[PDB]
From Swiss-Prot, chain B:
It is found in: Sarcoplasmic reticulum membrane. This is Ryanodine receptor 2. Belongs to the ryanodine receptor (TC 1.A.3.1) family. RYR2 subfamily. The calcium release channel activity resides in the C-terminal region while the remaining part of the protein resides in the cytoplasm. It comes from Homo sapiens. The chain holds residues 4293 to 4310 of 4967 of the full protein. Induction: By TGFB1.
């Protein structure tokens, strides 16, 4: 489909469901896990 | 949420050490 013709529907900032679909459960999974694994964030959470 | 994660890690550590 990349080489073939494509039609796309642009996203709307009003639609919250569109942003929810755009954000990924597994990517946010990985990102927050890495952030928690980071040592400096752990030090700042200790300070918290 | 971070505190809940730390608490869950602590609980797991307790379950494994006991």
């Amino acid at each position: 489909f990349s080489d073939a013709r494509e039609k796309k529907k642009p996203k709307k900032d009003s639609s919250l469901s569109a942003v929810l679909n755009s954000i990924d459960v597994k990517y946010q999974m990985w990102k927050l896990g890495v952030v928690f694994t980071d040592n400096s964030f752990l030090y700042l959470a200790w300070y918290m | 949420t971070l505190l809940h994660f730390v608490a869950s890690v602590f609980r797991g550590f307790f379950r494994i050490i006991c």
